[PDB]
């Protein structure tokens, strides 16, 4: 029972970074050597586990989170980092275990006119707790007078758009990111790779 | 505080070819105010997240202000090329800082036509990053030397942005301010509140 990472990796449409997706892997043998056929420069940064020796192991479970972010922002997906994404869009715990895989997708998520279907949150009252999603679109009160649903003076919309284009620089081209999180519990391991 | 008012509320911005250069140091800068310029405006930032600029600290901040056409605003970015990018203003690839562009059709438009905004059109080669060319010699496109007569193959290097409020969004004037930060061995002084 090879785990279906292909659907998780070869999907046509990844969700926005703020409303990221979540997928569960269970009761299947996982072959990690398959995904090496991806883009020739896919970052495979692994915390708490060596990437090469992942084949012989018995992860009690595996959660896969997939989204699309900016190039310069790819360094923000790491335990303990800070910034716009680490605070308001996606937070990783301090004692994180698992791997992050990032690869450029300028040939699939770029529109000469401009792709506006990828959004990201810019304003929030407080930093996100680890592994938390906030899809609310409430008006942000940056001042003292209550906004009451108008985007006037010191009242900003919390979401902005990644207006992707194929002519952008390397630091602004879209990058597809998939984060695999493992775990160990009292339950017996369900996903054991060859 | 820092003089971000005389740089964002000035009556007239300089031309794109002879763009302005403003030094900023020993000042406390509150960048959040820059979010009230317009309901919808361009705020790209390279190498630093905008939401984490009121907690970091730099040695000096350089502000460059000018006015460019609406559809050409995409040329002000590292690695880009076109007409403005290589003939008027070239951004280095190893760039950290922000570009802030917003429409100003209500302040830089004349029904008769604004002829005070100029841009260079002809140059022998391209421009190095952060370089200014303010020369005005006639340009010999062909082989015959004309020695300063605008006939055939001899065009004036500069053209004018004849702005009018009737024009579309792609031709309306846009005010652009580029803030550049850098770190040196010297202690930081330009910090947010």
């Amino acid at each position, epitope marked *: 029972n090879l785990c279906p990472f292909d659907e998780v990796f070869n999907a046509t449409r990844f969700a926005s970074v703020y409303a990221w997706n979540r997928k569960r892997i269970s009761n299947c043998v996982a072959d990690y050597s398959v995904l090496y056929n991806l883009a020739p420069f896919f970052t495979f940064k692994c915390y708490g586990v060596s990437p090469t020796k992942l084949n012989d192991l018995c992860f009690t479970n595996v959660y896969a989170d997939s989204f699309v972010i900016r190039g310069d922002e790819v360094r923000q997906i790491a335990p303990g980092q800070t910034g716009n994404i680490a605070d308001y869009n996606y937070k990783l715990p301090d004692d994180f275990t698992g791997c992050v895989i990032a690869w450029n997708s300028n040939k699939l998520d*770029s*529109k000469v*006119s401009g792709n506006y279907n990828y959004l990201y949150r810019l304003f929030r009252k407080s930093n996100l707790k680890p592994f938390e999603r906030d899809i609310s679109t409430e008006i942000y009160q940056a001042g003292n007078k209550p906004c009451n649903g108008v985007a006037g003076f010191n009242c900003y919309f919390p979401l902005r758009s990644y207006s992707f284009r194929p002519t952008y620089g390397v630091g602004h081209q879209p990058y597809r990111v998939v984060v695999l999180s493992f775990e160990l519990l009292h339950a017996p391991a369900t996903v054991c790779g060859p | 505080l820092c003089p971000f008012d005389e740089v964002f509320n000035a009556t007239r911005f300089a031309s794109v070819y002879a763009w302005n250069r403003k030094r900023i140091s020993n000042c406390v800068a509150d960048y959040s105010v820059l979010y009230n310029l317009a309901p919808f405006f361009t705020f790209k930032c390279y190498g630093v997240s905008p939401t984490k600029l009121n907690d970091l600290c730099f040695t000096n901040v350089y502000a460059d202000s000018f006015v460019i056409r609406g559809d050409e605003v995409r040329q002000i970015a590292p690695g880009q090329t076109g007409n403005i990018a290589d003939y008027n203003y070239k951004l280095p690839d190893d760039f950290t800082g922000c570009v802030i562009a917003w429409n100003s059709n209500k302040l830089d438009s004349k029904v008769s036509g604004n002829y005070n905004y100029l841009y260079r059109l002809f140059r022998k080669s391209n421009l190095k990053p952060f370089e200014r060319d303010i020369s005005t010699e006639i340009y010999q496109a062909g082989n015959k030397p004309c020695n300063g007569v605008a006939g055939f193959n001899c065009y004036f290097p500069l053209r004018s942005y004849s702005f009018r409020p009737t024009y579309g969004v792609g031709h309306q004037p846009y005010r652009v301010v580029v803030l550049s930060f850098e770190l040196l061995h010297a202690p930081a002084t330009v910090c947010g509140p």
Partner: antibody
Amino acid sequence: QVQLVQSGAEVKKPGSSVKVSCKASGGTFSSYSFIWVRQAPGQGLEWMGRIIPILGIANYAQKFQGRVTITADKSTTTAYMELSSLRSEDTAVYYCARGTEYGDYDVSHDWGQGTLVTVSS
Amino acid sequence: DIQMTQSPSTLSASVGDRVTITCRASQSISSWLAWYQQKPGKAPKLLIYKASSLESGVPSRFSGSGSGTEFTLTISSLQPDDFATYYCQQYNSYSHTFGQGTKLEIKR
């Protein structure tokens, strides 16, 4: 689920302007994009323009630039199209279409019934 | 402006057959493409977007494929309800042009 209702047929003189309304019901209004399409009486569809209200960005065809204006109303949850300086060949059937954020804003998922606009003497 | 052409302009088929329609773009449009079905006198209906993805509710007998400047759509088992006019649309770069429109009729 989500359905759109358009106004009635219109008959206008060449030297006039026309406003067409498009009221959408169902779901959340802010996660929508509105596009307008025109079909000649015998030929195929023609693209006119797209509006993203929540991002507040408008885009129109080069042929119709300076003539067509698309706006949105959150209070009534409607979309309005203003066409100015009509001509003899501007008579056609007009369709209102909506694009979702998750799928694609540019593509059209749901379509209105369309309004017939006639220009003559 | 990318000009989109379709082929054939008019096709004659019969119920139970498998039919194919080709759509060509003057310039590259990546994988951004959409197909619409319009009945006589009715509003169009979306069938396929992204040139491969099917809109929810569309019968599974439709299927499209293409990479760039060459796209195709096919119906594996033609049904009596499937006789209509089919239109292309590319949404890469502004002025999202449609196609000429391929019409589907019945053989006699």
